[PDB]
Design an enzyme around this catalytic site. Structure first.
Site, mmCIF file in Angstrom:
data_model
loop_
_atom_site.group_PDB
_atom_site.id
_atom_site.type_symbol
_atom_site.label_atom_id
_atom_site.label_comp_id
_atom_site.label_asym_id
_atom_site.label_seq_id
_atom_site.Cartn_x
_atom_site.Cartn_y
_atom_site.Cartn_z
ATOM 1 N N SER A 1 -30.475 38.358 190.408
ATOM 2 C CA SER A 1 -29.422 39.330 190.771
ATOM 3 C C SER A 1 -29.004 40.238 189.621
ATOM 4 O O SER A 1 -28.747 41.428 189.815
ATOM 5 C CB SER A 1 -28.166 38.619 191.281
ATOM 6 O OG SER A 1 -28.475 37.696 192.300
ATOM 7 N N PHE A 2 -28.898 39.659 188.425
ATOM 8 C CA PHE A 2 -28.531 40.455 187.237
ATOM 9 C C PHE A 2 -29.555 41.559 187.002
ATOM 10 O O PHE A 2 -29.197 42.702 186.740
ATOM 11 C CB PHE A 2 -28.448 39.576 185.984
ATOM 12 C CG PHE A 2 -27.376 38.525 186.022
ATOM 13 C CD1 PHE A 2 -26.373 38.531 186.988
ATOM 14 C CD2 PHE A 2 -27.348 37.528 185.041
ATOM 15 C CE1 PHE A 2 -25.364 37.542 186.992
ATOM 16 C CE2 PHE A 2 -26.339 36.541 185.037
ATOM 17 C CZ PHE A 2 -25.348 36.561 186.002
#
Lengths: 312, 329
Positions: free
Chosen positions: B119-120
């Site tokens: 996600s980052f």
């Protein structure tokens, strides 16, 4: 007595000639100028190399008058000291420090045999052929080699000297706690630390303070992290290389991996690991040979050559 | 008339008879570039899944939101995918013009960089002003082109691939979800499905940045998971991460690796990555280093990096890569 440039940790005393007392490995003295020279010694402990041309050996001169010049200490003295009494100098902006154990010292590196008496060991130890001075000389950097055979971060070879470690030895000018070392002109842009082999090469004995392997790991990591932190807080421009072998089933390398992660996690990011491989270990008692030292130097040299602005 | 184009990111290129060339994609941050002398341009879309931005010359980006199956009426032109599609794909059908227009030189970028992650790396909820986001708000506020990966590549004028998917880890995903999967099992494929292996002989990134482990470690093990102790999870994470980097290295000898993680989860994540780097170097793969990032505000959806955090991480990476002589070979 000529103006001098000094490399390595020395105690300077001015009673008579100014005297220079040293015990850490690979110390040197340089001068520049006529057509005659005399070096005054008071050292029955070290073998030296004089560089005017090819080097000339000066073996345990004692207290004598010896009739550009570079004097370099070759041998290791863990329990004694030696004195040098004197003769445009080098203005090297690059400075590099090597901190470590036998490997960093050059323990038995020029021995053609792995079997060595104590005498053979002393004589074939040449710190100037170890990776540290070779690396420094490649960049024309002044160097300090602060290393002592058998010592670890927290634990020493086979649990020897349990009252000591390289870290407890490290703050002092000589191999005794009488004088703490400070030099505001010593601020190496690069610090290479090689410690852990002695902490982990052997199994714990029952009378040591670590009662489990995990306790040893935890103590080693904590103290190595603190060590690099103090070095940094006193020298903001230092960049750290943590260097270790691929031996002891990878135990050494893994603990250093944890050290590096923890340092970066704490905000100290200018730290890297090097794990060295493929040495022949043909010097005394299965230690790095001169060949191995050149190999290790070539490794460091190539590594530092890829780092932009590492000296600025 | 379709123009010659340049593709960034993993794209399934198909040439079905009597139809436009079709570019199908699903990994984040895909882009298409073209250049021409002339005054007209049409983009043919078949994509109701993504938001895009369109960058014409030196002008501000224009938002194209789920265009669908349409011809879009609008020099250097860059089209970028912004959003994440984990369970679907989209198609771009090309840049169309008047036959009198002159094709011009496309970008010939020697530098190539790949970002692999979770996600980052995707940019999950990064432009959201709020940490509370519905699924629709999360989808809308995700802008992969403002995540640290594309921003890093652009500072060096490198082509980039962002092979990241939200929630995924080395061996263990967010709270043990998708236990039949990991980022590593998704990684070999061109799209969000097992149907085609990705192969691109021209894609040989000099730099590979992997940010994985937050999802392995951010939560406690549940009873039904295959690791029965934390030590088991550590061991399995370390072995597979080492295995992965070795595989990447074996197909791309030039690649230099950066393993990038947070200072969170009480340092558990950073520590396992330290063991990975050490085991890699110990095995003879020395071109690997760790980055531990700190001091983010996590003001995006569900406490994820903000667009600000993304810029900060980019600056970290840019400075790191600037200090490395000959990293682009």
């Amino acid at each position: 007595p000529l103006p001098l440039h000094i490399g390595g940790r020395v105690l300077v005393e001015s009673p008579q000639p100014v005297s220079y007392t040293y015990s850490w490995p690979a110390v040197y003295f340089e001068t520049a100028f006529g057509q005659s020279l005399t070096l005054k010694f008071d050292d029955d402990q070290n073998i030296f190399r004089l560089i005017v041309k090819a080097p000339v050996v000066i073996n345990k001169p004692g207290k004598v008058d010896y009739p550009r010049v570079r004097l370099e200490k070759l041998t290791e003295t863990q329990s004694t000291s030696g004195r040098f009494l004197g003769f445009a100098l080098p203005k090297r902006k690059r400075q590099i420090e090597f901190i470590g154990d036998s490997f960093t010292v050059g323990y038995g590196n020029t021995s053609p045999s792995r079997e060595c008496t104590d005498e053979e060991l002393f004589k074939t130890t040449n710190s100037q052929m170890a990776f540290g001075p070779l690396t420094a000389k490649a960049f024309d950097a002044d160097y300090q080699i602060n290393a002592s055979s058998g010592f670890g971060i927290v634990r020493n070879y086979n649990g020897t000297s349990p009252d000591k470690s390289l870290l407890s030895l490290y703050p002092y000018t000589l191999n005794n706690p009488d004088q703490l070392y400070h030099n505001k002109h010593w601020k190496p842009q690069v610090i290479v630390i090689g410690l852990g082999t002695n902490d982990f090469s052997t199994a714990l004995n029952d009378n040591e303070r670590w009662k489990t392997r995990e306790a040893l790991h935890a103590d080693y990591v904590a103290n190595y992290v603190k060590f690099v932190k103090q070095l940094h807080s006193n020298n903001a421009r230092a960049q750290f290389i943590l260097m270790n072998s691929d031996q002891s089933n990878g135990e050494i390398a893994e603990q250093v991996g944890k050290v590096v992660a923890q340092l970066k996690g704490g905000g100290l990011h200018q730290v890297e690991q090097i794990v060295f491989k493929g040495l022949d270990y043909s010097g005394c008692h299965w230690h790095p040979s001169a060949n191995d030292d050149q190999l290790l130097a070539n490794l460091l040299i190539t590594h530092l050559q890829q780092k932009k602005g590492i000296w600025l």
